[PDB]
Amino acid sequence: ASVYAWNRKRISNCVADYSVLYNSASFSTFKCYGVSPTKLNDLCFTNVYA
Amino acid sequence: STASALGKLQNVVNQNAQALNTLVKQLSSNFGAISSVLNDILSRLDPPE
């Protein structure tokens, strides 16, 4: 989507494996602010937004 | 029959209890950090922060 019409997706009721996202090198920039990326595999949230 | 004739001892007890209560409740403050519980900070962040 365009910047002024950015796409928003809502995620719930699933198991997420962020490890496969982090170990992949396909991304130029991967920056986590409130959490440590290596700790994401343990915390359980609700109401994820992408 | 008449009550409230022992205000001094009751006053002492109340003061002590109130001080202890506020000391305990101070443990829920934030002090400018992101959270007031050590476990959540420890289980969400890398040490350097």
Side-chain angles (χ1 to χ4, degrees), chain B residues 10-30:
Chain B
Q10 210 56 44
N11 171 36
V12 164
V13 176
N14 292 350
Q15 289 182 330
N16 280 313
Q18 172 165 221
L20 209 47
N21 190 10
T22 175
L23 169 74
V24 169
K25 202 195 317 297
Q26 204 65 230
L27 215 62
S28 174
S29 290
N30 219 8

Side-chain angles (χ1 to χ4, degrees), chain A residues 34-36 39 43, chain B residues 42-46:
Chain A
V35 286
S36 162
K39 301 256 199 159
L43 308 172
Chain B
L42 272 172
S43 87
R44 281 172 39 187
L45 278 193
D46 209 57

Side-chain angles (χ1 to χ4, degrees), chain A residues 1-48:
Chain A
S2 62
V3 185
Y4 76 99
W6 40 270
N7 191 18
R8 162 171 270 252
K9 189 169 176 62
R10 186 267 182 275
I11 300 303
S12 69
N13 303 80
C14 64
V15 289
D17 190 4
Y18 309 90
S19 183
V20 301
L21 269 299
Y22 203 70
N23 52 44
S24 167
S26 303
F27 318 112
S28 308
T29 304
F30 196 110
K31 186 180 289 293
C32 286
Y33 281 138
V35 286
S36 162
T38 186
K39 301 256 199 159
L40 288 164
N41 282 116
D42 298 333
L43 308 172
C44 184
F45 315 92
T46 193
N47 189 179
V48 183

